[PDB]
Design a protein around this ligand. Structure first.
Ligand code: FAD
Ligand code: FAD
Lengths: 401, 401
């Protein structure tokens, strides 16, 4: 940890990192460069209560555990020179650094077949994006969503609540193909279909003409607006130009180190080890942004601290479904606790590998999720009959292990 | 470049690296730790003329462009401490380093289903392995090869020449699935079948009993010896234990830097950018070991030098087939120069992407391969009719571009 510290990006990973630097006792300069001219804000509300209610002053991040930080908002870092230890800014200024931290996140992938579209086509990443989409959620209008990921489905639910007609096209045979157990994905599809979403599986967009989107089965979907949600691409251009190892994401170890000395990276922009799979992955979650930012900061201030070690998890709010997913989507065994039903949905899935818990899901059961994450963290091998048995309380099991 | 330099591994990448350090003008200490008690040697002969003729004094690497190097042969590096800048050796000694270079290569993957086998099961990586296999190539014995990669096929050809009966099992529907154009792979299968190899496609080994191997179609193959060649796994254990970013290979940038300051890696152990695909890959070739070793050394001595930038290529000698393959296996177009025939085989393939050369293959045509590699290097977009036209000479085309 060499002063001064410069962080590129002012999202959750950056805010979490600089707050932990201060809490851990670092008292040198910290400067954060953020391209959005916005008080730092959290993204999960954008497809949830913000999309529904519109008050951005409910979604700001707390920067008060980050005192004495200069936030350069509305400024783009254009390049850095890792030999000279400087960053070039879009406003003509240059920042010196002792330690540079790349926390630049990820941006929605564009859909090549809609490149020349003459109808509204949006993606959903920023506050600006959310305000633009919301301005078009007219009651009884028609929305087409491309992609059955969690964000598309949260938007689908929000739009249906607002009285908007919703169609959704997904190339895979299931929703949430990226990080959800098949049992969950099948149930979620049934839920959205029951709520009026017109779901089209194993279909891809081939183009559009005069307000109508074309599909690869030779058919058409008319819409007033298209929202593309087919995933994100790491914002790693500065790292690539400066010579760091990257591949749709900056490679980092558990200390947040890139291949360039004195340069670290954190959050959505990184490709990092998933401890459960033991493979490198670009993690795209709120908990990773916060937890990885905190761990990297802690170890910079105190090199005796462990590297980042948290296991992955996320949540998604989709209408009446409060979904929580931890760890791996599958193993060699799934245990289902409760009935899987559209009538007052409430259930838990547990994924095991050779008897060891490797993942869990809760739908409308926050109370089960915390003890399951603890059992997952220690790789618990509990009695499978008890895991299934409705009489088992998981909190005590987590306390006993 | 901080002295002293320590290199772990004494294969081609290591030898190429230390020779280039000396040629570039570095005069400080260099110590190489190699676990094999063997004068450094090249591996390609092991499935080729060595397997056939047995003289290891024809396969040694030239260490004479690497003067003043201490080679610790027969010694295993057990760990390194990147804070203390030391390496712990199996003989009880410790080496200090200013710059550590990990050049530890890769080892054959074991086949889980043959773990408890009570018949000879070998892999082919080392001189010791080659001598062991050769000692069993009895005329009229039966060899089963698991895996249709280049090394398995070179062994198949060598064994057939020696009068050994050969069967080969491949899980994919084609040979050389990893890095060869389908047109080449189809031809190579026809060649081996014509030479008496019993090829079994889309089959996998499920086990073995009393000298007989079991397949997933419920059938059996009797053999006197099995050679497993289903690929390799990076020897990255020291890097993993020391906290570097790795995933079946140590991640490096074009300067050979790992995520740990003062630690570099090169050759088969690395996962690195393929400039043609723009994706990270673990390259498994002789040319990468030599060329990456040289480039990393050059830039350590002279930081103004470019990073590693060579495009991938390899060769394979399989009986009457002298195969050379460069770049990508496929694009959006293949051009075939010559007839593809078992009668005096001689042809060239060119792979293009939007008119740009992205790969090439020569079978028994070394003269075409050099100019094609030059056209590939500059991403030439030549006239496709001329590329097909037998009247075109490629050397002049390469000289003109
Ligand atoms: C609509 C939406 C809903 C989501 N819902 C959930 C959820 O419910 N649960 C969950 O687990 N996760 C959710 N997420 C994911 C979560 O919000 C992300 O994982 C998190 O935002 C990643 O934070 P980050 O700081 O790494 O990146 P970002 O939030 O992307 O912040 C990076 C910032 O850096 C800026 N930047 C990029 N390049 C430069 C440059 N050169 N110079 C200056 N600034 C630059 C970017 O514009 C951005 O402002 C959601 C995300 C979205 C978009
Ligand atoms: C049979 C065979 C045929 C091949 N044919 C071709 C061909 O025709 N064309 C082609 O392009 N490529 C071919 N190759 C591939 C080519 O030989 C490899 O790409 C090359 O050997 C990689 O060199 P390297 O120095 O990175 O690794 P290696 O050659 O594997 O050298 C690494 C050395 O480090 C040692 N080591 C590992 N861990 C430690 C430790 N902890 N301490 C000390 N030493 C350690 C290893 O045992 C090994 O001796 C062939 C390989 C084989 C095995």
């Amino acid at each position: 940890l060499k002063a001064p510290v410069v962080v590129l990006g002012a999202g959750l990973a950056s805010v979490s990192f600089v707050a932990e630097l201060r809490q851990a006792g670092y008292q040198g300069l910290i400067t954060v460069v953020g391209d959005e001219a916005e008080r730092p804000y959290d993204r999960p509300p954008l497809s949830k209560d913000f999309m529904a209610h519109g008050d951005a002053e409910k979604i700001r991040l707390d920067c008060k555990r980050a005192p004495e930080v200069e936030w350069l908002l509305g400024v783009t870092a254009q390049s850095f020179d890792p030999q000279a230890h400087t960053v070039a800014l879009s406003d003509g200024r240059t920042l010196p650094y002792g330690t540079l931290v790349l926390a630049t996140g990820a941006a929605p992938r564009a859909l090549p077949t809609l490149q020349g579209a003459t109808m509204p086509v949006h993606t959903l990443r920023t506050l600006e994006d959310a305000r633009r989409i919301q301005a078009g959620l007219r009651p009884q209008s028609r929305l087409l969503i491309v992609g059955g990921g969690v964000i598309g489905l949260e938007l689908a639910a929000t739009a249906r609540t607002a009285g908007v007609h919703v169609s959704l096209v997904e190339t895979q045979p299931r929703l949430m193909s990226r990080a959800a157990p098949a049992t969950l994905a099948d149930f979620v599809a049934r839920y959205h279909a029951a709520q009026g979403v017109d779901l089209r599986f194993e279909r891809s967009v081939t183009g559009s003409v005069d307000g109508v989107v074309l599909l690869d089965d030779g058919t058409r979907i008319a819409a007033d607006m298209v929202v593309v949600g087919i995933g994100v691409l790491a914002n790693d251009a500065l790292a690539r130009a400066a010579g760091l190892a990257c591949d749709d994401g900056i490679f980092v170890d558990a200390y947040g180190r890139t291949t360039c000395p004195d340069v670290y990276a954190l959050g959505d922009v990184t490709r990092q080890r998933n401890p459960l799979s033991g493979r490198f992955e670009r993690i795209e979650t709120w908990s990773n942004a916060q937890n990885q930012g905190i761990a990297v900061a802690r170890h910079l201030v105190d090199p005796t601290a462990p590297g980042y070690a948290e296991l992955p998890w996320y949540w998604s709010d989709q209408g009446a479904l409060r979904i929580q997913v931890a760890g791996l989507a599958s193993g060699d065994e799934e245990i289902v606790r409760g009935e899987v039903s559209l009538d007052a949905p409430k259930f838990t899935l547990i994924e095991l590998q050779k008897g060891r818990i490797v993942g869990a899901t809760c739908v409308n059961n926050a109370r089960d999720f915390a003890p399951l994450r603890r059992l997952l963290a220690v790789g618990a091998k509990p009695d499978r009959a008890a895991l299934a048995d409705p009489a088992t309380d998981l909190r005590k099991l987590a306390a006993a292990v």
